[PDB]
Amino acid sequence: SHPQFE
Amino acid sequence: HPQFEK
Amino acid sequence: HPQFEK
Amino acid sequence: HPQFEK
Amino acid sequence: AGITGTWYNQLGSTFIVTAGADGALTGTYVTARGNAESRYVLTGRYDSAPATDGSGTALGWTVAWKNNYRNAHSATTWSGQYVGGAEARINTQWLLTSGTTEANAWKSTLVGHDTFTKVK
Amino acid sequence: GITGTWYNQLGSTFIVTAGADGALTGTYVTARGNAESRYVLTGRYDSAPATDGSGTALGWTVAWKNNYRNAHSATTWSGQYVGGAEARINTQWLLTSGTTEANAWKSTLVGHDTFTKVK
Amino acid sequence: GITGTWYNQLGSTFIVTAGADGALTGTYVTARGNAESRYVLTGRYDSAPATDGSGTALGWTVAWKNNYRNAHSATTWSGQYVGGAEARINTQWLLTSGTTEANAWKSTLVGHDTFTKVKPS
Amino acid sequence: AGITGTWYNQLGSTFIVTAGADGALTGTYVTARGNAESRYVLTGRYDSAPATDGSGTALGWTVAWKNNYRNAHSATTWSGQYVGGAEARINTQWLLTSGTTEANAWKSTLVGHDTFTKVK
């Protein structure tokens, strides 16, 4: 779960 | 370039 | 991943 | 290009 | 296959491919001009046993830009996945590499993306 | 020139044949080296390169399924062969894994490999 | 025309100011949209682009650490702004994660974002 | 943090960077020619609290190729990691984008890689 794609 | 020619 | 297995 | 100039 | 058949990008090019049961992709890539001089061989590979949970099917293929009529001294590879369904698509990222001298290698490789669909 | 046995920096082996028709065919062997680690490759190369000292463009694809295992991914390598004393194939690669739509945006890794004829 | 609020196809927001000296500064807000989802960005752009109808080159970086969380990674976007009717910023990006030496091959992802002034659904 | 200072690539370019406590990177990029006409401003960001398991320190930075002497109407971004120790290095992949008309957008973006070290 990376922040760029959350 | 052929890939992009019209 | 296989490509990088040691 | 500057990034690769000599 | 869901992959075998004809695929179109938004710029006018067409990819005609057969997906072999053993994981092979073979076919022809035709540039926008649609001419006999605009057809080039393609070959590649795809996962012939993909997951069945809605995940895409990994695949890639290569065109070297030489035919019996012209030679652009370059090759493109596309890397991407097939997504099936009524709005089936192949989403790719591509790398185009031109032959260069050692000195000029810095400008050898272009990067970009293409989406191919079953309808134009 | 191209046809032969090549090695990357990590210990993999690239066994290739460059045909008169522009075809690349062969086998990619990962660093392990056992039977489960051999994969089919296919690709294309410029069979009539410039004679001005430029390299020969080429590319090939491995799908990471053999008869033993399946990593639901494929890698393409794009690059050029530079011949002569100390022949090398310099490449950039893209590894795409099959994902759901929600995870597409993290589907593709990029990196670079240099292949030589000495291990 | 660069300065303002832009949105990419996933709903993230790029809040940017283009300085007279070629500086880009601002905030990147991930699609979740809360306080924990805001990150500082900095970059550069061509402050005197060609008048032949070409786009404006630009780039920027976000390191994915704020006061609430740290993803030990950074993403750079390289691209160009294309003005006019429906303005857009077309980019490609690289996301690198800090890794050990043995894991450097899953350290960098690549992809592409298109930013417009209109938010999608 | 270990990053502040002067770094060199193998082509003969130099970059002089200061890592700020807050995660900022600011500095100058100098091309291999080395003169005033070859100096460009850089700005970027880095993880100011990296993991302590031996992982590298993620970072990235941008240079726009315009100074007071010349404009190449382009920008490069480097995305990478700093690796500390006696033989410290910064390992990167880069994207160089040129401004182009819409029809020429396909040739807008080159990709490559660079490794910077503390010694020439």
Curated annotation (Swiss-Prot), chains E, H:
Keywords: Biotin, Secreted, Signal. It comes from the Bacteria. GO terms for cellular component: extracellular region. The keyword Signal applies. It is found in: Secreted. Its main location: secreted. One of its GO terms (molecular function) is biotin binding. Residues 1-120 form the Avidin-like domain. Biotin binds at residues 29, 40, 78, 94, 106. Homotetramer. The biological function of streptavidin is not known. Forms a strong non-covalent specific complex with biotin (one molecule of biotin per subunit of streptavidin). Belongs to the avidin/streptavidin family. This is Streptavidin. It comes from Streptomyces avidinii.
